[PDB]
Ligand binder design. Structure first.
Ligand SMILES: Nc1ncnc2c1ncn2[C@@H]1O[C@H](COP(=O)(O)OP(=O)(O)OP(=O)(O)O)[C@@H](O)[C@H]1O
Length: 252
RNA sequence: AUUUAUAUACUUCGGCUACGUGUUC
């Protein structure tokens, strides 16, 4: 039973002070949500496994029931290592993820003597105490010695480490603005290798409509269409992602 | 030269901080 926790959502989502703030917030919550979705899907691809194995997602949590094999464990550990590398490379304190798992048996799941709750609490506890130790030695040394030439804080996004560009905006928040602009009109989001917004596994997210999504399907491209609460799509890798995106300002 | 001594009605009714504008280089 594998559990994942996102570290810093309540902080990173609430460093917004600009005039376009509302557009980013819809884009920022969606950005974290899509991060979690793409990372969990990518994990399930590593496990050569099915989507039905995801028991619960939401907030910064995720719950999976995967095979108890040494192979599974080595893959989980390796992907955790690469994952931690990537987040350290992009935000380094604002967002982190945690991995944890604890053995369970069939007798446990069948609700024999309430041990289901015992294992649930055990996995929660291991997830919540592995967050104490997040950084090995060499990583913490690696952070502290970068006399690296960089620019200053993003206006929309409060971050010293980030480097601003045109109009005093960094790349990440400008892409956030663009995808926010596209949010209200277009309903489908694609996982593509060129795209707009930087995403974990060397991937990028852009926006599509059902027709060019269809062409992408007949383009046999390794794509995952992520939708805005649309059933009956039947387009490639159908992913009716569950999200509430409402704005009265678009009713004018 | 011998009785009043101000009396009742109404004791303010009608009509209820706008703009430049919030954030950064
Ligand atoms: N994409 C998101 N955008 C905005 N708020 C979110 C998003 N995802 C989750 N949240 C909410 O923000 C809350 C605060 O997140 P927080 O940073 O405290 O991390 P967490 O997931 O609760 O875990 P922990 O605090 O143990 O690290 C979450 O509990 C959740 O309800």
């Amino acid at each position: 039973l594998l559990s994942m926790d996102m570290s810093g959502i309540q902080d990173f989502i609430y460093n917004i002070s600009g005039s376009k703030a509302l557009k980013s917030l819809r884009s920022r919550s969606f950005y974290l949500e899509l991060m979690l979705e793409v990372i969990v899907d990518q994990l399930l691809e590593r496990l050569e496994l099915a989507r039905a194995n995801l028991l619960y997602t939401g907030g910064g949590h995720a719950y999976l029931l995967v095979s108890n094999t040494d192979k599974v464990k080595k893959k989980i550990t390796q992907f955790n290592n690469e994952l931690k590398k990537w987040f350290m490379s992009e935000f380094t304190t604002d967002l982190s993820l945690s991995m944890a798992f604890e053995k369970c048996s069939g007798d446990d799941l069948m609700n024999t003597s309430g041990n289901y709750r015992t294992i649930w609490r055990n996995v929660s506890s291991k997830l919540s105490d592995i967050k104490a130790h997040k950084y090995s030695a060499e990583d913490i040394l690696k952070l502290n010695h970068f006399h690296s030439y960089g620019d200053r804080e993003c206006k929309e996004c409060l971050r010293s480490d980030i480097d601003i560009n045109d109009d005093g905006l960094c790349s990440i928040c400008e892409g956030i603005i663009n995808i926010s602009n596209d949010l209200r009109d277009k309903s489908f989001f694609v996982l593509s290798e060129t795209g707009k917004l930087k995403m974990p596994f060397n991937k990028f997210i852009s926006v599509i409509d059902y027709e060019e999504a269809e062409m992408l399907v007949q383009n046999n491209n390794q794509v995952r269409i992520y939708s805005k609460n649309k059933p009956y799509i039947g387009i490639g890798i159908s992913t009716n992602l569950w999200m509430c995106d409402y704005d009265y300002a678009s009713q004018n």
